[PDB]
Amino acid sequence: AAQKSFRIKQKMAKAKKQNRPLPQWIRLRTNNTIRYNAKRRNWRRTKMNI
Amino acid sequence: DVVTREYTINLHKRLHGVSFKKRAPRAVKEIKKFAKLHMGTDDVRLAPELNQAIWKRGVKGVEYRLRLRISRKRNEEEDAKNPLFSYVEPVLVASAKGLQTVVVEED
Amino acid sequence: RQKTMIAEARNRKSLKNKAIMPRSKLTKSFGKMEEHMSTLGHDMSALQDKQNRAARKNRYVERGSDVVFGDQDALTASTENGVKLRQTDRLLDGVADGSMRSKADRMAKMERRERNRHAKQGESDRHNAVSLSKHLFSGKRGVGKTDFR
Amino acid sequence: ANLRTQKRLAASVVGVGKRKVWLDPNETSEIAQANSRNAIRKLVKNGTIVKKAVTVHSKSRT
Amino acid sequence: QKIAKTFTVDVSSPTENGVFDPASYAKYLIDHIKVEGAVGNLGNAVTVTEDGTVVTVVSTAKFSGKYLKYLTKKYLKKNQLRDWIRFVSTKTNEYRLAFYQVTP
Amino acid sequence: MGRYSVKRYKTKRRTRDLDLIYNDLSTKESVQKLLNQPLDETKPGLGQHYCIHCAKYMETAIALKTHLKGKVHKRRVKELRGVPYTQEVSDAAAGYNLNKFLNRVQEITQSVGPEKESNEALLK
RNA sequence: UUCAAAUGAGAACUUUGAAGACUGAAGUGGGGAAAGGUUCCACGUCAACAGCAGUUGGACGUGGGUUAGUCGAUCCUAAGA
RNA sequence: GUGAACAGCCUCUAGUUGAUAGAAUAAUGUAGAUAAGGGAAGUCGGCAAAAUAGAUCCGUAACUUCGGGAUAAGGAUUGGC
């Protein structure tokens, strides 16, 4: 809307920074349980509702 | 055996009683099949000029008697099908009638 | 002749629909123009005389410098990178060894298999499904206000 | 390969719509390599892209 | 009172090439020059000449360089040398003919 | 063809023929009687204001001059200006007797030729 | 909708060219308001999706990009809290 | 531009060619039409189906809260140059 408040823009910026798949080097540890991050979200499917 | 034998084609023979929406595609299919039957090959290519000529009158108004020529060409290397290859090419005439198939010598 | 010419012009015009390329800015070839000049039957003597004029770029094809770098060999090695430019890659730079890089790629390829079986749009799509519908498994369709059309 | 991006950029830099850009199928390597406004300007100066000016809309019968 | 107007067209390059007939061009201009309706009713007002390199026209009555260009291209197509003879203007009211950019 | 043509020239809707038109126009005594009828109720014109050439009742009194000034009535007049002809002319042309046809044409020209003009002058 | 060319292991659908088309300016255009929130764009890549294929993408992976003494808020007030 | 018109119809600037396709065209529909002669005859029922339909001129009844009814009904004409 190009009129968001600063806190709204900050929330969206944090969401954008969060939006990434898993780094590859994580799987190279010992006794690992992380397979694929379930917190990944895309605009098409899920809506954060601010 | 590279040969060139200018034939004649009438659309009315094979476009009679067909859907108005697909007159030109039907003409294209009939032209390629006619070339196939009158040559005896596997690969047939049309000419952009012939496409222009057939579509030019209209999508549902293709002219009946159109003059075309067929050229045999030897296929390039690494062609697993055959050296056989046919290429079509249009040519305009003053009158549709009065012409028949004529072989033209290579020059 | 006039009937043939008018037929050819009608075929070639096509002015109605889109456009006509300007003859002043189109490009041609003297190889093509030779047939037309012969058909007009003019003096070819003062026409082919311009062919030798093109003897300027004929020697320019040679440049030297390893005979233009000795074929295309650096491209094959330079195109092996997953991404170009000089920026930090949070996936490539995470693992240094190529063997471990291949191992990580294999791990990712294997891991995506379960989501592929589940037919999810990707690692991010998680749209669940409801077991039953309140508006499709209740009510009595008596006379009057129907449940739905 | 892909030339829609080049076509759009050329249309924008010329000032006409993306349907009014002409390309040479014979010479495509240079236009594929070109991706800057200066590159488009220099190639159109070279004459590899035409303006294909507006179609005729006569009013003589009117 | 009335001021004459002069136009000069240079056909040096293609005529020296040998695909041009300046005498025939001048003859056509003389025969088909049209002023105020009919053709051939010129009242000794507009004259043309040819020297072998440049065709010069002097007109006292109504005339335009655009109309001169139109007549030139009409004769070009009638002789069927279009797509091969290019018309341009050197400066104001002065024109020239030239080849195209075949450069194969 | 299922359109205006049949809907206007259907068998129910017919008009008089040029032959009978010529006959009544030639008959001087019929010219007056074609309009001096006693009275009518069925036709929309009530037996009044019937244009012989157009073969229609005007349904009123002042529309007569309007239709006369109209071009359609002039078109019918121009059509009537032609030679009547009949089936005998066609038969004579189609390989039959010509002397009788020539005699009939000569008698027509000598007797009834100016008769139509005289009747028109007397009427209008 | 048609043909040709190119890429490509593989082309009814990718790109270009050559034609035919339609939207017909109260548009399928040009901007925006709510809302949407990185989807805009570039580069490599197509197992998962675009009920069909996809060599393509509003998909995948990595990055770039919004500059206000004059544009709006921030200033004032209405029905209201 | 067509006209009374921001109707519909064709075109210009701009934009799109996206919605699974190919081979033949039987019965049963979808939306449309057409039909010789009779002209609403059965149909609960003149219901989807047809007729005048635009513009100019003439004359327009009963009734009346005298302001309407009224485009009442009907007739004559409609081109090109």
From Swiss-Prot, chain A:
The keyword Ribonucleoprotein applies. It comes from Saccharomyces cerevisiae (strain ATCC 204508 / S288c) (Baker's yeast). The lineage of its organism: Eukaryota, Fungi, Dikarya, Ascomycota, Saccharomycotina. Its main location: cytoplasm. GO terms for biological process: cytoplasmic translation. GO terms for cellular component: cytoplasm; cytosol; cytosolic large ribosomal subunit. It comes from the Eukaryota. This is Large ribosomal subunit protein eL39. Component of the large ribosomal subunit (LSU). Mature yeast ribosomes consist of a small (40S) and a large (60S) subunit. The 40S small subunit contains 1 molecule of ribosomal RNA (18S rRNA) and 33 different proteins (encoded by 57 genes). The large 60S subunit contains 3 rRNA molecules (25S, 5.8S and 5S rRNA) and 46 different proteins (encoded by 81 genes). eL39 interacts with YIH1. Component of the ribosome, a large ribonucleoprotein complex responsible for the synthesis of proteins in the cell. The small ribosomal subunit (SSU) binds messenger RNAs (mRNAs) and translates the encoded message by selecting cognate aminoacyl-transfer RNA (tRNA) molecules. The large subunit (LSU) contains the ribosomal catalytic site termed the peptidyl transferase center (PTC), which catalyzes the formation of peptide bonds, thereby polymerizing the amino acids delivered by tRNAs into a polypeptide chain. Keywords: Cytoplasm, Ribonucleoprotein, Ribosomal protein. GO terms for molecular function: structural constituent of ribosome. It is found in: Cytoplasm.
UniProtKB/Swiss-Prot annotation, chain B:
Pfam families: Ribosomal_L31e (PF01198). SMART domains: Ribosomal_L31e. InterPro entries: Ribosomal_eL31, Ribosomal_eL31_CS, Ribosomal_eL31_dom_sf. GO terms for molecular function: structural constituent of ribosome. It is found in: Cytoplasm. One of its GO terms (biological process) is cytoplasmic translation. Keywords: Cytoplasm, Ribonucleoprotein, Ribosomal protein. It comes from the Eukaryota. GO terms for cellular component: cytosol; cytosolic large ribosomal subunit. The keyword Nucleotidyltransferase does not apply. Its main location: cytoplasm. PROSITE patterns: RIBOSOMAL_L31E (PS01144). Component of the ribosome, a large ribonucleoprotein complex responsible for the synthesis of proteins in the cell. The small ribosomal subunit (SSU) binds messenger RNAs (mRNAs) and translates the encoded message by selecting cognate aminoacyl-transfer RNA (tRNA) molecules. The large subunit (LSU) contains the ribosomal catalytic site termed the peptidyl transferase center (PTC), which catalyzes the formation of peptide bonds, thereby polymerizing the amino acids delivered by tRNAs into a polypeptide chain. Component of the large ribosomal subunit (LSU). Mature yeast ribosomes consist of a small (40S) and a large (60S) subunit. The 40S small subunit contains 1 molecule of ribosomal RNA (18S rRNA) and 33 different proteins (encoded by 57 genes). The large 60S subunit contains 3 rRNA molecules (25S, 5.8S and 5S rRNA) and 46 different proteins (encoded by 81 genes). There are 2 genes for eL31 in yeast. This is Large ribosomal subunit protein eL31A.
Swiss-Prot record, chain C:
It comes from the Eukaryota. This is Nucleolar GTP-binding protein 1. Signal peptide: none annotated. It comes from Saccharomyces cerevisiae (strain ATCC 204508 / S288c). It is found in: Nucleus, Nucleolus. Residues 100-128 have a biased composition (Basic and acidic residues). Transmembrane segments: none annotated. Associated with nucleolar and cytoplasmic pre-60S particles. Directly interacts with RLP24. Residues 96-149 are annotated as: Disordered. Involved in the biogenesis of the 60S ribosomal subunit. The lineage of its organism: Eukaryota, Fungi, Dikarya, Ascomycota, Saccharomycotina. The chain holds residues 499 to 647 of 647 of the full protein.
Curated annotation (Swiss-Prot), chain E:
It comes from the Eukaryota. The keyword DNA damage does not apply. One of its GO terms (biological process) is cytoplasmic translation. GO terms for cellular component: cytosol; cytosolic large ribosomal subunit. It is found in: Cytoplasm. Keywords: Cytoplasm, Ribonucleoprotein, Ribosomal protein. This is Large ribosomal subunit protein eL22A. It comes from Saccharomyces cerevisiae (strain ATCC 204508 / S288c).
